Write a protein that binds this DNA or RNA. Sequence first.
DNA 1: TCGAATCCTGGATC
DNA 2: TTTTTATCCAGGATTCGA
Length: 1118
Amino acid sequence: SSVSALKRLERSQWTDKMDLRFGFERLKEPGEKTGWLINMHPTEILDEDKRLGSAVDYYFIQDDGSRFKVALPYKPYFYIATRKGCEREVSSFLSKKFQGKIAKVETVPKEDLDLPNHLVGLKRNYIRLSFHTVEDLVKVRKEISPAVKKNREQDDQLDNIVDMREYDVPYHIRLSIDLKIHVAHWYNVRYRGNAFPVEITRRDDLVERPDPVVLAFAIATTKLPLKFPDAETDQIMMISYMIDGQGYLITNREIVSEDIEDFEFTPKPEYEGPFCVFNEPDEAHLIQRWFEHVQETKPTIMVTYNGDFFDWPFVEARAAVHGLSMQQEIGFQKDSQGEYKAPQCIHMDCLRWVKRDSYLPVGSHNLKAAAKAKLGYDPVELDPEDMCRMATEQPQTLATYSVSDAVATYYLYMKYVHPFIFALCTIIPMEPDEVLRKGSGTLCEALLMVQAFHANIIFPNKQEQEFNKLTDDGHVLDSETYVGGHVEALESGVFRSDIPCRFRMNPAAFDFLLQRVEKTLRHALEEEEKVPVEQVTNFEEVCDEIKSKLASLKDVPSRIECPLIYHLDVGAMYPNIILTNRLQPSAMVDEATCAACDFNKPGANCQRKMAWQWRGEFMPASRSEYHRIQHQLESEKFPPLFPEGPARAFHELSREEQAKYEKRRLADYCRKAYKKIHITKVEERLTTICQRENSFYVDTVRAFRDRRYEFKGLHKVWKKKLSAAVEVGDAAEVKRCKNMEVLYDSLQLAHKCILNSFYGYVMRKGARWYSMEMAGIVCFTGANIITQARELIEQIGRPLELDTDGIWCVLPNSFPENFVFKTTNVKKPKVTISYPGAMLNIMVKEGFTNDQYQELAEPSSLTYVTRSENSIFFEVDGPYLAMILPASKEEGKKLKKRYAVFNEDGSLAELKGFEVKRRGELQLIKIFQSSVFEAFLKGSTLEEVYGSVAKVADYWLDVLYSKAANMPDSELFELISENRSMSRKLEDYGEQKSTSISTAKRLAEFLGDQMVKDAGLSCRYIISRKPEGSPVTERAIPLAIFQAEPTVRKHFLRKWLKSSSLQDFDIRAILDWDYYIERLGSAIQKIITIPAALQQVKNPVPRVKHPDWLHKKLLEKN
DNA sequence: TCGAATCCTGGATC
DNA sequence: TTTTTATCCAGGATTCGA
Ligand SMILES: Nc1ncnc2c1ncn2[C@H]1CC[C@@H](COP(=O)(O)OP(=O)(O)OP(=O)(O)O)O1
Ligand code: SF4
Ligand SMILES: [Ca+2]
């Protein structure tokens, strides 16, 4: 014990002296102060009995820049349940048995949503146990739970206790939940000495955030040519940073051959970036100066791009070589999870945001690309191997490179990252860096814990994972799942609003539409717009125009017209599907509970039934065959946990080992004994949703939905006010307005992020509120909605592309489009409607609306009032100028999820899926695909368009047939090389073979394991001819070899090309040109020529032949 | 000996 | 002690049937 006690006191006193050094004095004096809460960390402190107890530190920062700490003592606890009447006997036994370790025990009636017949108002007694310290809590937990495990498996006093709950919420989460303390608010803190607990009370009238000191830093180092750096070998060359918009540079005058003057680097007036420079004689003085300047300026946020991977481990390892210690000078230390942390300031890494919340493609995750897109300028680059000569040859262009990435890290953090995390913390009980690092499911669970606590619900336990469960007909399941979203790719080629197109249409559909126009217009005005139809005067003229247009269409259905291209999209579909049906993870019920519920009377209306599709995958072996395989394990012997350990018996396997050994036997036996390894069985089920259950989940979803639109509105209002303030030109008003704009923008994004999170959480393994039914019923109802939206549109027009929530289509030029009504409302003198929207919203209204919605009108009365609700509405984007869809090289298929679209202005609207955006992909194909889509805008008819794109492909085929005749050799390498990336370490692929693995081994052979050592490797290779007939995986040759020393390059090529006397090693001699020609060929086909053959034009490029199935079909049709 | 189907991985679209 | 799902493309290799 005493070792633990003194360890805890030692670390507490060290941390308290460290944060005292940075100025976070503890609040000492009787009095009241106010401050913005910025951080919290758990700590233990002595009580009036001189006994340790658990506490939490709160860190406050004041308006004037002063800072203070406060410690709040609080006792952790958990709940247990007992059989009839046992609570007095059990609590007395508990208190005598664990005497001195458990502080208090008490009986509490809790409302648990799983109690049979609970809707009448019953609830059950849980005993609470509360402890002096979490150290003592864990021991009693471990003494208790072995009896609960046996009691649960069946279902003295200790035998009687039947369950335990809430035993695994973290201590600071529990404290933030229970006392409602949240970060980025303003508080009053009232202190009275040890005589009484310190009191913290929020005040909502202070709105301006303070401005914490932010430091952003980057480092540059030496390394050996053509190899990765390592901290035992390589010195640091320079370190550069910004603090609150002033920049500094430190330079090592060993390597760098001259002093560097001070200078300004300013990408745009938005980013001033002044820098001031210190020249130091040694690495040790360079590293001394940085720690001195941090201890001087005492930052509260430290930021660096991907610093946890390289920069921090490097500057730590280089400090140890000079007898300094980062953990004593600064205070940062590497946690068990391999991430740096400190008590006194927060380490925020932009790349955890870029990777989670930006919706950039992985190709754009490179720092300079992210800056290019988000900040709209190009930084400068140096080739990583020229830096070491540049340092001697021309120092200041290296300094100019080194600055650019500090500047870009600082302004990227300030603009995008900073408002988002400090907005998102205002609604979630977590630390800022936890909120950044944690997954969105964990962010979404704590919120429901907060909402369940105040409703006095008791948290359910985490979900138990089943292993190798049986199908209900006795077959072991490898999986369970639900069928997801629906996709179709109906048509291919080029659609342009500039060229005629042929339509054929059902006149009874136009008649059906014309017969109901007024319903659709009324419903679109009253229910969506919320303008009563009596307030509009010109209504009948608009209906006369719409009817006469439909009548004109109904006479002549088959026609040639220019197209109109429309996208129709459901807004926030899945939340609205939840809100409309009252789906809740607890609300799904079986026959057995309804049979017990007193409301289950004839004429009750509470049972709503909905359908979903289950899809198991199961093995062919029978139950008895599996059980005989298990019996064959009853006598088996197994290897030890480690080579020194004794051989294990079957009960000494873990349940995961037993499961995997049963999988190994059962799969192998099935493989031999049966023809195919598994069988699928898609199956239809129906599930009841109790309409009267407690509404806390759906009310949370609704509240977030409403707040998002409120903050969007205020954001647009304040942005307009910002434009007005900018025209006024007064800096104080502009600054105030900008602050309000950023506040509402960040709140709006936070609320969108949480709204989007609610769908994903309910399927997470281990989730407290988990169900599979609700997630399947949502996807199925969305698929029914989009199927009926396809069925309707196929008769009015032609759908082109259909996906999870929306449809692309063409409509005939004479279709109604948009109409403007005139209204007497003073705020709303005009209203504009689009007929394609109202046409579908009236279809959704009739089928989907829910007639059973109930709410409890008077909690004491047991009276519920029936309602109705329907929240699902379509909206209309566009129209667009042009739309180009590709086609498949196989006969019976078309490509889904790929297309391009252009705006009316000819600017690129969308370009989805194509290689032009993907990471690690062949540049020649990227440039081709880029140039063709811009070429489709040219020309004036299909035969002009297909004639005019062909000249872009014949340029590149002239290149590949010329072997780059004029092209200077430095261009060719980047044009031709791939750049694929390998996720796992080289061992972990095991037996698997691939071009990346095969070129990783080729790197190990060439440079040693000093390069394979870490994951996330990237491989650049060419593919080579000379090993004739050998499969392609063997011919990958690393690009690096073309920069090696001649005697190394020749030796290794002669080893790899198996060509002993080979005279020429020129890349033009080695390239397998006919591989690349057929890579280009299969892309030019799929874009230009197969779709052309689908639009009654001949092959527009002679050099590339059709596939034989198309050659037959064309020859026979001719 | 020759052709088709299944499998695995890295990365995108909703 | 952790951890959001499902549908789809392109490339390369291995096994079974005619
Ligand atoms: N990252 C993700 N994780 C899980 N499901 C996702 C997802 N992204 C999309 N989905 C699924 C679930 C939602 C669905 C997209 O349809 P909505 O209309 O709900 O989303 P949206 O178009 O973004 O909203 P709008 O801009 O119209 O307001 O795709
Ligand atoms: S659906 Fe009706 S009968 Fe069944 S549990 Fe709910 S309230 Fe009771
Ligand atoms: Ca949508």
